[PDB]
Write a protein that binds this ligand. Structure first.
Ligand SMILES: Cc1cc2ncn([C@H]3O[C@H](COP(=O)(O)O)[C@@H](O)[C@H]3O)c2cc1C
Ligand SMILES: O=C(O)c1ccc[n+]([C@@H]2O[C@H](COP(=O)([O-])O)[C@@H](O)[C@H]2O)c1
Ligand SMILES: O=C(O)c1cccnc1
Lengths: 343, 344
């Protein structure tokens, strides 16, 4: 098969033939404007998350001339079309808003991580995600993210919750500035005073990003109804998985929540995803194989060398798509064919 | 029993059992900040739509200290979501003040000045967005309402611009129904915009429509294309929407999946003629919910029997679904009296 399943625990059977809703949660981080923590090029980073979800929902970016080595939203759009997957998208603080219809949970971007001032309202954000979740329906929730800099806020949250994660976080590019990232989050974990006294929300408030409580609410509201949730992302979704255990360890016991990502994230050298998960729980981690070795866009080959890797729920929706008899090469063909248009 | 049906045509069974999505589309009109076309108090008109959908989704209003002079019909909508656990997501298409609850933002800019013929310039694009959003919503039945202060005026202008006999037929928010101020406004606007019979539905919407109209059109046509039923939960405003649905896609109408769902207070409004608008449009089920509000225990609710508020926020349409699916009508009225002091 083209699906690496670690701690599968029956899950892939849970999502076979089930009707999905896909949703991507986007956010922007103040720090990224002046500190190069993110692998998203600075000329497009204010526009990248919205252009991502526009490409998924509508088939064309509008906030940019082209989409953002192409954006992983290319893979997410591939699966949306190739398997006709309904998708709605959520804003929790992107600098520039989507010109497609979208759900507005929070207009204000994630603040400056290095100051312990990520956000003053992570619990409110959590409740909005759960309430929003209560009013969505499907047999399965595939929930992704588009947060430039999200691997840095993922580091702080994991660390702030007492996990061992240095060097373990991934990145949206080949280079992975782990030292800058550690320096950034440590400064704000300290300015905000996070210790082992602190709640999950104290930590999110210091160094998290606003996508995280929202996706936490969504996931728990869906798992509580014994509906499976595919946390579609890499490193970042292990921070959310962690946050979900600090919020309701009970539902996590239910076995209804799996991380779904790409081969390029599972098999990433400059990080260690399964190591972080291990410290959290016996949770299914599922990577999807895309065979971009045999590609015809050298932008797509570049995924095999650490360019991009993941994002916009690409890996987890591919997992879903592939479990439901999608030929994994179609993804590569789709992007291949649509490429000249988009760019 | 508790449901009056014009040309029911079997629609009632098509909706029994099926599980619904309720969505309210809100908007605001610049014209209501200067001209008294609307029955909403001027002091809270800028803040009403947002507060209405707050009440319905979250159980209480946040932009105002209390829900929106009589009591807003969101209480009716609110009541029904809790009693039949109707899932609900709400849509903004130009309200002055955005809601504090999670909402789908389609257009932040309000509806323009009706009298100048400058309601909007993106009606076709708003319809394409409502349609594409429809595609990505899943339910067995869509119940789509609205909350647009001044919306009976834009409904009149749209109906008149499309060649209908609609004067004196639109209903109103409060007991008073300034029909001729309404007519001067939209006729002024139609003239400035140059609408005549060669104009398109979108030219008309851009002259004197409101932005919720084409969004609801898109939502309704997408669900009905997929053979799902659709309740347009509104009064005369939804007859304007119904007219719009017919210009855009006549044949979907002919699939008998789209009905209007309103209150008894609208269908029995002598200061209006909902029935008469719709028979010029086509043979479409018109369904109204009986509330038995004279047995009411708060005069504000009771005030409905005399023409205050009447309808709004999918209240009539959401009740039709909640009654067709075996909810006892009085539970609505006894719900709103139990919490009247919490809200107020
Ligand atoms: C062009 C491009 C578009 C993307 N959209 C999402 N991601 C992905 O990379 C980001 C996280 O990595 P970091 O911590 O380096 O910001 C997220 O936005 C994730 O969705 C992208 C990555 C790239 C290169
Ligand atoms: O469409 C109708 O027939 C109708 C009848 C009574 C009340 N309404 C509600 O009141 C507003 C429209 O009425 P008006 O008088 O402000 O044009 C808007 O908020 C609607 O939800 C609408
Ligand atoms: O592991 C992640 O979360 C990740 C890696 C690369 C790009 N975006 C996200």
């Amino acid at each position: 098969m083209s699906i690496i399943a670690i701690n599968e625990n029956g899950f892939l059977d849970k999502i076979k033939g089930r009707n999905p809703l896909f949703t991507c949660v986007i956010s922007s981080i103040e720090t990224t404007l002046s500190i190069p923590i993110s692998g998203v090029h600075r000329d497009v980073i204010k526009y990248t998350p919205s252009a991502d979800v526009e490409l998924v929902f509508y088939g064309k970016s509008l906030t940019l001339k082209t989409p953002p080595s192409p954006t992983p939203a290319t893979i997410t759009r591939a699966c949306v079309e190739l398997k006709n997957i309904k998708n709605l998208h959520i804003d929790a603080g992107a600098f520039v808003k989507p010109k497609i219809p979208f759900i507005e949970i929070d207009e204000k971007p994630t603040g400056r991580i290095e100051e312990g001032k990520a956000m003053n309202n992570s619990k409110e954000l959590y409740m909005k995600g759960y309430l929003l979740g209560k009013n969505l329906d499907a047999e399965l929730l595939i929930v992704g993210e588009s947060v430039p800099g999200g691997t840095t806020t993922a580091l702080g949250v994991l660390l702030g919750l007492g996990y061992d994660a240095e060097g373990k976080v991934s990145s949206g590019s080949i280079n992975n500035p782990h030292e800058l990232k550690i320096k950034v989050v440590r400064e704000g974990l300290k300015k905000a005073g996070i210790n082992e006294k602190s709640s999950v929300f104290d930590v999110l408030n210091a160094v998290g990003d606003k996508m995280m409580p929202v996706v936490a609410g969504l996931a728990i509201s869906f798992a509580e109804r014994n509906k499976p949730v595919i946390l579609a992302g890499g490193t970042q979704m292990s921070a959310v998985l962690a946050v979900i255990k600090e919020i309701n360890k009970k539902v996590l016991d239910k076995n209804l929540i799996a991380i779904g990502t790409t081969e390029f994230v599972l098999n990433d050298k400059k990080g260690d995803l399964k190591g972080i998960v291990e410290q959290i729980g016996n949770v299914p981690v599922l990577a999807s194989k895309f065979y971009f070795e045999k590609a015809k866009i050298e932008g797509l080959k570049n995924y095999c060398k650490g360019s991009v890797k993941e994002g916009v729920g690409a890996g987890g929706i591919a997992v879903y798509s592939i479990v439901n008899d999608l030929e994994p090469t179609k993804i590569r063909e789709f992007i291949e064919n649509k490429f000249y248009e988009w760019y």
